[PDB]
Amino acid sequence: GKITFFEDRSFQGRCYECSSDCPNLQTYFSRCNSVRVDSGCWMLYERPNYQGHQYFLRRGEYPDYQQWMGFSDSIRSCRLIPHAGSHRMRLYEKEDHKGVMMELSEDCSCIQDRFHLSEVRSLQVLEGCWVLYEMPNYRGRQYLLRPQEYRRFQDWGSVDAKAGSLRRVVDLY
């Protein structure tokens, strides 16, 4: 993957290119108002060491922070997310993988329609990386999921169990 951060909107100002993850972008810039992704799938974070708000970005031009549903011009770390050849995950109604369950191997733009619940209280991510969105149609707070089990919402960094949509992390061409 290849990503370039710019201090100002419209690919203007001080800039930094990355090709692998970075635990701390603060050395290189103090604000980020536009991004160009050349290649790969990227999680951006509001804070250093992959904390605070998370933003999912893939190949394309982002002329301002709103384009990636940003909450501020703070961008202080980033992960390059691995492509996976297939995706598979289980959503549970209750913590610790109990209650009703739904299996997912494609993008789901409305959990509520398929599952009949507004919250996912535990997850088993078996294959691929995914982005969980607070809201349907890939809107609201975003949470990067990776292969592992999540016994409760705290394990993915959310404020609560509310979840509207799920996206497979797949590279854009």
From Swiss-Prot:
Checking InterPro entries in the record gives: Beta/Gamma-Crystallin, Beta/gamma_crystallin, G_crystallin-like
For this UniProt record, the keywords arranged alphabetically read as follows:
Eye lens protein, Methylation, Repeat
Chain residue ranges for the region called Connecting peptide: 83-86
Q: What is the effect of changing residue 10 to G?
A: In strain: CD-1
User: Does Repeat count among this protein's keywords?
Assistant: yes
Impact of altering residue 13 to A?
In strain: CD-1
In the UniProt record, does the keyword Translocase occur?
no
SUPFAM superfamilies linked to this entry: gamma-Crystallin-like
Pfam family of this protein, just one?
Crystall
One of the GO biological process terms:
camera-type eye development
Where the record annotates domain Beta/gamma crystallin 'Greek key', the positions are 1-39, 40-82, 87-127, 128-170
Q: Which Gene3D superfamilies would you find in this protein's record?
A: Crystallins
GO MF: structural constituent of eye lens
* Residue list for modification S-methylcysteine: 22
Family per UniProt?
A: Belongs to the beta/gamma-crystallin family.
State the function annotated in the UniProt record: Crystallins are the dominant structural components of the vertebrate eye lens.
Return the domain comment text from this UniProt entry.
Has a two-domain beta-structure, folded into four very similar Greek key motifs.
Q: What else is known?
A: There are six different gamma crystallins identified in mouse lens.
The protein's name: Gamma-crystallin C
Designated gene of the protein: Crygc
